[PDB]
Amino acid sequence: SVYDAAAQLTADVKKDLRDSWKVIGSDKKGNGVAMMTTLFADNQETIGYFKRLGDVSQGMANDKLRGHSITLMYALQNFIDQLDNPDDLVCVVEKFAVNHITRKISAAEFGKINGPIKKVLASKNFGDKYANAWAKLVAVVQAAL
Amino acid sequence: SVYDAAAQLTADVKKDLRDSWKVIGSDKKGNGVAMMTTLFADNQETIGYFKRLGDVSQGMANDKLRGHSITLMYALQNFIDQLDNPDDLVCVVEKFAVNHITRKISAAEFGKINGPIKKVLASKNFGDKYANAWAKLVAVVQAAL
Numbered sequence: 127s128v129y130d131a132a133a134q135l136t137a138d139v140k141k142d143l144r145d146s147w148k149v150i151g152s153d154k155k156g157n158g159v160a161m162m163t164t165l166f167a168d169n170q171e172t173i174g175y176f177k178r179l180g181d182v183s184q185g186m187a188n189d190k191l192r193g194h195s196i197t198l199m200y201a202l203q204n205f206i207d208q209l210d211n212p213d214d215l216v217c218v219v220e221k222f223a224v225n226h227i228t229r230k231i232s233a234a235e236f237g238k239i240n241g242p243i244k245k246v247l248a249s250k251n252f253g254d255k256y257a258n259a260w261a262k263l264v265a266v267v268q269a270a271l
Numbered sequence: 272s273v274y275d276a277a278a279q280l281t282a283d284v285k286k287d288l289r290d291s292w293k294v295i296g297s298d299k300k301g302n303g304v305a306m307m308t309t310l311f312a313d314n315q316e317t318i319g320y321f322k323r324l325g326d327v328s329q330g331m332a333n334d335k336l337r338g339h340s341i342t343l344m345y346a347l348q349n350f351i352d353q354l355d356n357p358d359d360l361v362c363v364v365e366k367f368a369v370n371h372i373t374r375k376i377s378a379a380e381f382g383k384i385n386g387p388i389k390k391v392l393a394s395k396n397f398g399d400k401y402a403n404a405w406a407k408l409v410a411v412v413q414a415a416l
């Protein structure tokens with residue numbers, strides 16, 4: 127359940143999440159777009175869910191894609207800010223899940239974001255240790271889907 | 272259309288928005304909830320859109336309402352962060368409007384948030400000068416609805 131998954135965010139996992147976000151969250155626009163383009167490149171099958179975005183291969187030049195990518199980063203900002211309080215983290219994660227559940231995005235589908243996150247981390251000198259910390263955060267959302 | 276509304280965000284308006292947000296955005300949970308509860312108190316009819324939240328009379332204690340309130344503040348955080356780049360502000364505002372348009376929330380209905388905002392600002396001692404600034408930011412969103 128989401129409550130059991132939130133309990134997996136141990137002291138050091140939270141610390142690694144903050145230290146890495148300090149860098150990644152510094153450029154929401156650039157890293158947000160990189161994340162999305164990587165998702166569409168490594169998992170072309172997910173492009174179907176983003177029909178409204180138009181030609182996703184335009185990247186930064188696509189206004190809708192840029193708007194979505196920036197916004198996506200503020201959801202992560204939200205999660206990071208709620209790390210101190212499990213109760214708040216959970217209610218924010220369930221809230222976040224509503225629209226994704228409506229879109230029929232399953233836990234397995236959502237989990238495909240892990241690859242893109244790991245690659246963006248690596249591009250900024252953050253290794254497996256951090257990719258795994260983020261996989262744990264993503265797992266909290268998966269538990270809500 | 273949204274670009275024209277964004278044009279009303281002058282240097283002075285952006286300055287007042289950033290200064291007031293520095294305080295209001297420092298307690299997203301507290302002010303976020305204050306904003307929704309005030310909305311429901313002053314315009315009870317708006318509750319019709321939030322049936323999913325359940326017993327909104329519980330206020331802060333209501334996990335779903337708390338979750339929504341905290342999340343609402345990150346949309347404003349997003350807007351405030353894009354103030355110096357009209358192109359990014361616009362794409363973020365249009366991305367934001369999509370779900371609200373789907374909910375059939377008109378510009379007139381959305382404008383009901385102005386009262387609650389003015390009251391929340393006043394509770395932190397930010398006068399009319401600041402309320403007007405915020406009314407202008409809301410107007411940018413209204414232009415997208």
Ligand code: HEM
Binds near residue numbers: 198225366
């Ligand atoms: C780190 C993971 C992710 C984050 C933080 C994230 C964040 C967001 C946010 C903030 C929104 C806007 C609010 C909403 O409509 O719910 C959104 C929309 C959306 N998300 Fe997610 N999302 C993530 C991963 C995914 C994945 C993996 C998929 C699908 C495979 C997905 C599909 C969608 C779709 C289709 C939209 C609507 C886009 C549009 O039409 O503008 N999301 N997401």
Ligand code: HEM
Binds near residue numbers: 224
């Ligand atoms: C400054 C004003 C507002 C901000 C920043 C704001 C922000 C948000 C955000 C970030 C979401 C989550 C993403 C989404 O589903 O679109 C949302 C959801 C929602 N908003 Fe807005 N909103 C505002 C005003 C309003 C108003 C005035 C109404 C209606 C009278 C409205 C009705 C809704 C509803 C019904 C939801 C879904 C709630 C749920 O079931 O969880 N919003 N809004």
